[PDB]
Amino acid sequence: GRVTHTRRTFDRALRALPITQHSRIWPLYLRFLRSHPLPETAVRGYRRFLKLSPESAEEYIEYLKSSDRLDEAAQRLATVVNDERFVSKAGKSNYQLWHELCDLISQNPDKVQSLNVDAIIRGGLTRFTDQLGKLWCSLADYYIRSGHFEKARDVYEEAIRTVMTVRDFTQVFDSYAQFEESMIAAKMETASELGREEEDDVDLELRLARFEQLISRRPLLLNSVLLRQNPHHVHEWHKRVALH
Amino acid sequence: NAEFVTQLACKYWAPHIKKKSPFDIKVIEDIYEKEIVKSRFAIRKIMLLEFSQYLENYLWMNYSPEVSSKAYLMSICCMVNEKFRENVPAWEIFKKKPDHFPFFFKHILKAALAETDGEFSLHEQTVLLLFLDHCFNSLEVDLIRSQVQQLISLPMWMGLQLARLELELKKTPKLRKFWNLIKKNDEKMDPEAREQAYQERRFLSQLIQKFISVLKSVPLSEPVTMDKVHYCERFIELMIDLEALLPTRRWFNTILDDSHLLVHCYLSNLVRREEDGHLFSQLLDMLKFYTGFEINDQTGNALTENEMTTIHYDRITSLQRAAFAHFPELYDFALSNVAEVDTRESLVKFFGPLSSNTLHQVASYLCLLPTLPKNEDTTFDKEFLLELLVSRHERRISQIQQLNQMPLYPTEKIIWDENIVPTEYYSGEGCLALPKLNLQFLTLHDYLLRNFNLFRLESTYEIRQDIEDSVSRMKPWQSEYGGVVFGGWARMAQPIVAFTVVEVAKPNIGENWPTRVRADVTINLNVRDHIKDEWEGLRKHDVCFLITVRPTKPYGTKFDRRRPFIEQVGLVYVRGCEIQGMLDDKGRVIEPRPNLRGESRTFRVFLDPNQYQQDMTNTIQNGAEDVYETFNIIMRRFKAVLETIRNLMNTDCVVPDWLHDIILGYGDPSSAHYSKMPNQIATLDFNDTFLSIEHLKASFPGHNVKVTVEDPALQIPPFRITFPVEAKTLIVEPHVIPNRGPYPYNQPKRNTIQFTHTQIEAIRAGMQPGLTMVVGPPGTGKTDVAVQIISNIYHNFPEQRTLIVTHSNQALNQLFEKIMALDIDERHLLRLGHGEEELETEKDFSRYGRVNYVLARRIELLEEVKRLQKSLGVPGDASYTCETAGYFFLYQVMSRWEEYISKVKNPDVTEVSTFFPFHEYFANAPQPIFKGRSYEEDMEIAEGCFRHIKKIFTQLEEFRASELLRSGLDRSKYLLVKEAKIIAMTCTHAALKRHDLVKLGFKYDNILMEEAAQILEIETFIPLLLQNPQDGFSRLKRWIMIGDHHQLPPVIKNMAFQKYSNMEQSLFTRFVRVGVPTVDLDAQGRARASLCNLYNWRYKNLGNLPHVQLLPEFSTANAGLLYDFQLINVEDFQGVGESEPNPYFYQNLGEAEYVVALFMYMCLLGYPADKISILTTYNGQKHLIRDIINRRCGNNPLIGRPNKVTTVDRFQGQQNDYILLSLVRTRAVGHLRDVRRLVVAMSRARLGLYIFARVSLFQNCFELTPAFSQLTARPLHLHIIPTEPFPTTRKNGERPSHEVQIIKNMPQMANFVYNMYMHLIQTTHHYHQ
């Protein structure tokens, strides 16, 4: 109950520096962390700026990420996301992928301002690339938590420029059907821009039916887009469809 | 009629006359009609009348409604105009006698609205336009605001069309309650008072209508008078001022929108006349830019893009609704969305083929004009209707994109433009499309655009006047195939045989401009030998110009002085350059020079950080020519700045919310005091200030000292001093600074300065969060107070960074030198620069010096760790680096201290010695530290030794960075990042590397500034953007600047900048003008009271310390001069008073030779040649003094050289025991009107000043009356004691015991000097050679 016994214990145990007494000192600071974040914070700073090992900041982060202080946990993770001489601070073990999993845990439906989740997805994609999966999820969340007016059209245009695989046009289709009325001139020309989308056998129907069944009136444009969407090679019934 | 005006003045109004003739309305009318009216408002007659002080002595003191006449009104208006032109306080007469100010300003506004070309001509009407603009821009004056009060107030909306005002009250419902309140309060008004109030409210509308009609009365191609054009121009100038001032625009801009003055302007033939209306169209362009500025009318804050876009698209939506309801031809137009019609193109494609009366109906339904009745003809053209509609509903580009699309270089359409970048001969009669930087800005972007326009206009004034320097001697000629040709020989100019851009070095991260751009200029010196020596004496950093001209006068065209030099010589562009050295046959810049063979010399120069950045931007973005290749000349005697402005404009400029409105000048300016900071630290340690409890009692004249300890021998520590929040009680809590070991050499360094209570109040305002300005008079210790405040801040705040900004080398070197005597370790002080910087301190604060000190202290710390290991008796022969030293500290020293603590803190004074186990670590120390008499003191000394070892380990933990950064630049960056808690640099270096350190890891927590009166509005607005914000808030917690509002400001390259824009109004002086508290030191110790009175009259209770009052050196007589400060008249000699060898090269051999006889008399009396300073009113006068002195004394073995013979302002920041002032001016007073330069040249003497001046010329200077009162208290001759050598035991007051000579003139003075020197030549001899 008094810090004198624990401090003197850890001090006389640090007489040498073999593997022993780490499993005392680290959990000693961990138990001190209750009722005061100061011992855990300063001991974590001293450890991660102290004696040489890969697992020092690992145990510090395992103790600090379960806590109610995430700045200290991601701060150990930042001293790790430098590593200052060693890309593979762990190798096939990943602690930056761990930071990205923490970023997903913070992108969980807690801070829904549509700012921090997308910024954390950009930070996790910037640490290590996330190709079309977390990228498709980040573009989906950015286009879905956004509005309907030209802001959603710009979101879907940039996300199309960055798009990798199919169903990104489906995400832009969702944005368009939700944006059925973004202005009083073309009424979300995104319906046409996405119905005439990529040329052969990909969706051919997604954005068309989106504009068609926003609720329903009559699209009168989805037909022209879809039958103008690359019928078979040049000489065929293609003129008949494009004329009908 | 110069003699007529002078006789009339001396008879009726001129000062320095016993009896004056009384005022007569006939006198005023005759003077005006016969001098201004007959000679068409003469500038020289205006100047002579100003020197006669008609407004201060004649006009207003006898003016009244019964004396109100057109001549008197126009005379007072022209006097205020000339006051603004010459930068003199103008309305002091109105502040003295505000009684007839209502009738005066009312009759002036009546004259401005009166019939044009009637009683008051267009000349007087434009004069009244500019005078009214001045009366609006001087609205910080109570009485002028009193006349603008109801005239520019919200009741100014009484002049708008009924539909527009009704729509305004509908869009802002709370305006309807205020309108009802105004209508109700108007009921209690008299008919005369009601008519006066409505006339005041409609004055602006009637004036705008009159100006628009004056414009419409100008024909397109037929020649018209320039006066009407200039009247419309000055009207647009007043419009621009009242449109850029927020509380002045709030209501007037609504009437300006209702009238659409911009529309009639851009429709008139005046805006189509390229040569007639160039500057007027430029002013109208500024007005349209400001009318389309994104600033909320209701609160004054800048709007969001969503806000302005909503406004435009809502106008579009209401226009579409109005189309559907009232225009059948526009059913499609009502069906067209924002993206369909918001561009001028489609808006005009829909509104242009409409009818004239139809567009009038559109305007009427949109409340633009009077309603168009049935079957009528609208007298406004379809051109007018469609233009107004398209300008109102067409898309506008944001100011952000507009500012970012500007190339940062001056082009060929600007280099020769006087309407925005005028010359140095500009008299001030006309207007310039110039920014206004005085008091308050609509937004930070507004103030930044003004400051950026000003900096770029200064650079264009440097690319205009020096641009015509392709050899400027004999008007360079055009030659075969239009090429250049040198027609003569030029001394200060030469044609360059080539110029090659040698280095394009990469920028620092973040900034948008390279770090170094150099060019080598090759010229073949086939000219005189001494001229070639002057040329080849090239050195480092010497300011050079590369000049480009595309001359148009063919070979042999005559030269004419009064013509515009720019077009005369065909100038193209001139960019500055900084020569690093001459290149020789080894390709090396000159750093014992190698012997030049041939006459070809190539010099390597590099202008700026962004030297070759701005022209690159121009040629890349908008097709400008490569200006670094068409230059013709090299001549000796702003792109990075605009890039820093762009950084400010393109970043969110996240400024402290307590500094936003402060830099904007609006609101309550007292919210910046440590008295208005809610974050004040109640219990603070000013420790290094208070030297005693008596001193702590003396620094609090009106405070009750409540000291928590009564024992007097136990209260003078670094005593903690808490300030209250009964209500005057300051708590003195004694302490003890904890020991740091056994060596008495580690005793913390303490100040020796007994700072007065005012200086202590300034240091305390600095050590309490917020902003402060400390007024430092000559010799009150501004640098000392800065070092003391920084000391206290470092004392109470260990992790905080101190950002010490300065203007010049002497200021920062004084900061470091005074810091050298404080208890500050050499690991926390850091210095930046612009490159090369002479170390003017004792110890090296530089980058390389810092890495070297790091290496030295790291050697020391690792050696202490090794010797501590030996003291511990450890096995092992290896040496330890800082990582191993940290490991060993935590392993043994911390462990040993833990053992000692568990032994002695859980209890004998014998145990104090038994259980300190580093005895072999303390074997090299005083006799055993633990004395064992007292357990507490023994524990203190032992813990101090263990903490000393801990500080060794902490210095090693710091030096980890020096081992982790192999490069010197890298380790120095690491020190500036973590090790540096003191970052001190120049404003130029801040504006240069601002973004660089910002992306590199710069921090700012507490900032101090020196020479705040020497850095510009933009140069002092720069440091606010030194870092990035932290979590939605800036990191800046405090800024304490020390300056002097009465001293020299930064110098404008071409004086047209302060002439028109008044950019000389610095941030410090502008804060003073706001009225912010200034902590005014007044305790001098460098000038005895008699000499100090020459500058202490200008300040707030300026005094001297007991040191200056009682110094034995202070009242010591000046050898051979019974006068300590003398102003001796210099009459005509050889017929010459003020003389002029070259245009504007003023010199006076008369006062020069009087100063020569005086300085040679000092040399012949033995006065120390170091203590003889020669200053002048002209650099030409300094050069004449130097030439005549080196021609007469030269190597006279009895005579040294006067330490300084140079420019008055170029001697600022310095002082002398004797300053010899040459006031050559006797024809015009010149720039001596500036009280700043006055106090500057008057505070150059610590104990002795000898001035040769024109007594009557000086007394005629009204600004120089408090100075001439102390000047003419002495005889107007040289009153000396010639037989008195260097040592004179006599006091300043004690009677002379020698022969007194009263020399009446320079010829007798020089003859007597030569005769005394001749007797010295027959009796004595010197031997230095």
From Swiss-Prot, chain A:
GO annotation, cellular component aspect: catalytic step 2 spliceosome; intracellular membrane-bounded organelle; membrane; nucleoplasm; nucleus; post-mRNA release spliceosomal complex; Prp19 complex; U2-type catalytic step 2 spliceosome
GO biological process: blastocyst development; cerebral cortex development; DNA-templated transcription; generation of catalytic spliceosome for first transesterification step; mRNA splicing, via spliceosome; transcription-coupled nucleotide-excision repair
Keyword field: Acetylation, DNA damage, DNA repair, mRNA processing, mRNA splicing, Nucleus, Phosphoprotein, Repeat, Spliceosome, Transcription
Domain of life: Eukaryota
Assembly notes: Associates with RNA polymerase II, the TCR-specific proteins CKN1/CSA and ERCC6/CSB, and XPA. Identified in the spliceosome C complex. Component of the XAB2 complex, a multimeric protein complex composed of XAB2, PRPF19, AQR, ZNF830, ISY1, and PPIE. Identified in a pentameric intron-binding (IB) complex composed of AQR, XAB2, ISY1, ZNF830 and PPIE that is incorporated into the spliceosome as a preassembled complex. The IB complex does not contain PRPF19.
Protein family (similarity comment): Belongs to the crooked-neck family.
Protein name in UniProt: Pre-mRNA-splicing factor SYF1
Organism of derivation: Homo sapiens
Residue range from the parent sequence: 124 to 367 of 855
From Swiss-Prot, chain B:
Oligomeric and partner information: Identified in the spliceosome C complex. Component of the XAB2 complex, a multimeric protein complex composed of XAB2, PRPF19, AQR, ZNF830, ISY1, and PPIE. Identified in a pentameric intron-binding (IB) complex composed of AQR, XAB2, ISY1, ZNF830 and PPIE that is incorporated into the spliceosome as a preassembled complex. The IB complex does not contain PRPF19. Within the spliceosome, interacts with SNRPA1, SF3B1, SF3B3, SF3A1 and SF3A2.
Region Helical region with structural similarity to ARM repeat domains, residue ranges: 1-398
Gene from which the chain derives: AQR
Protein name listed in UniProt: RNA helicase aquarius
Sites bearing N6-acetyllysine, chain numbering: K999
A Pfam family that the UniProt record links to this protein: Aquarius_N_1st
Gene3D superfamilies the UniProt entry points to: P-loop containing nucleotide triphosphate hydrolases
Effect in UniProt of substituting K782A: Decreased affinity for ATP and ADP. Loss of RNA helicase activity. Disrupts spliceosomal pre-mRNA splicing and leads to the accumulation of spliceosomal B complexes
Keyword entries, A-Z: Acetylation, ATP-binding, Helicase, Hydrolase, mRNA processing, mRNA splicing, Nucleotide-binding, Nucleus, RNA-binding, Spliceosome
Alphabetized GO MF terms: 3'-5' RNA helicase activity; ATP binding; ATP hydrolysis activity; mRNA binding; RNA binding; single-stranded RNA binding
Comment field on protein domains: Contains an N-terminal domain with structural similarity to ARM repeat regions; this domain functions as a scaffold for protein-protein interactions, but is not required for RNA binding or for ATP-dependent RNA helicase activity.
Taxonomy of the source species: Eukaryota, Metazoa, Chordata, Craniata, Vertebrata
EC numbers for this chain: 3.6.4.13
Catalytic activity: ATP + H2O = ADP + phosphate + H(+)
Species, as recorded: Homo sapiens
Function per UniProt: Involved in pre-mRNA splicing as component of the spliceosome. Intron-binding spliceosomal protein required to link pre-mRNA splicing and snoRNP (small nucleolar ribonucleoprotein) biogenesis. Plays a key role in position-dependent assembly of intron-encoded box C/D small snoRNP, splicing being required for snoRNP assembly. May act by helping the folding of the snoRNA sequence. Binds to intron of pre-mRNAs in a sequence-independent manner, contacting the region between snoRNA and the branchpoint of introns (40 nucleotides upstream of the branchpoint) during the late stages of splicing.
Binding site for ATP: Q754, Q759, G779, T780, G781, K782, T783, D784
Keyword set includes Nucleus: yes
GO CC field: catalytic step 2 spliceosome; membrane; nucleoplasm; nucleus; U2-type catalytic step 2 spliceosome
Family: Belongs to the CWF11 family.
Subcellular location: Nucleus; Nucleus, Nucleoplasm
The keyword Coiled coil belongs to this UniProt entry's keyword annotation: no
CDD domains, alphabetized: EEXXQc_AQR, SF1_C_Upf1
Region (Required for assembly of the IB complex): 399-1329
Major site of localization recorded for this protein: nucleus
